[PDB]
Amino acid sequence: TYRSLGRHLDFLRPGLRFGGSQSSKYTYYTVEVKIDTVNLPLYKDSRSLDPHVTGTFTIKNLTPVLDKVVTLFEGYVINYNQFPLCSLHWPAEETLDPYMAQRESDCSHWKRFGHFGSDNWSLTERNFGQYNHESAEFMNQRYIYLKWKERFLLDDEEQENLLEGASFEGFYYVCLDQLTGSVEGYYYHPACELFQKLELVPT
C-alpha cells in the first residue's frame, strides 16, 4: 500500500551549499549551488518521474552591472535502472526530453570524469557496460551521477520568479564524490562540441 519516503545523503540533502567555479578557455566565473529539494529514485513509482533534485545557481558578477544572477534548476539522478547512464533509455515522459543527448555524448561525458573501470565499454548497452551483477546500488557507490538543467530566472535565493535563448539550450552532466563532497560538472551544449567545466566543494 505505502511508498518509501526516500533518503537524504550527507552530500545530497536540502539546505546544502557548494561553492566553486565554472570555466573554460575563455570563461571563469565564481558560482554557488544550493540544494533545495531531494527525491532520490530509490524505487520506480510515479514520484520517480518528478525531479530528483531541485536547487539554485548563483553567478557572481555576470555583467559589470549585475552582481548576482540566480537561476532555479531541476535534475535527475542516475540509478542505473529506470534512470540508466544512457539518457535515451529514460522513460518516455515528455518532461524528461530536455535531458536527452545522443548515446556517444552521454558515454564520453560520463567517462570523462575518470571514475569508471577501463573494462567492458559498449556504446549499445543501457549503462554503457558499467553496471553489472556485482555493482553496488547507486546510493552505495562512491560516485553519484546526475543531470541538471536550469529552467527559471529568480531575483534572490529566496525564490520568486521573474530562459529561452541559445545560451540556455544544454544541460550539466554532474558527478558527486560522496566521500569528499567534491562536485564536478560539464555543461554540454548540443550545437557546440565544447563544454564548460563546473568545479565545486561544500561550503
Partner: peptide
C-alpha cells in the same frame, strides 16, 4: 548555462 567568454 553557457556563460559569457569573459576572458576573450
Amino acid at each position: 548555462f553557457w556563460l559569457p567568454a569573459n576572458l576573450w
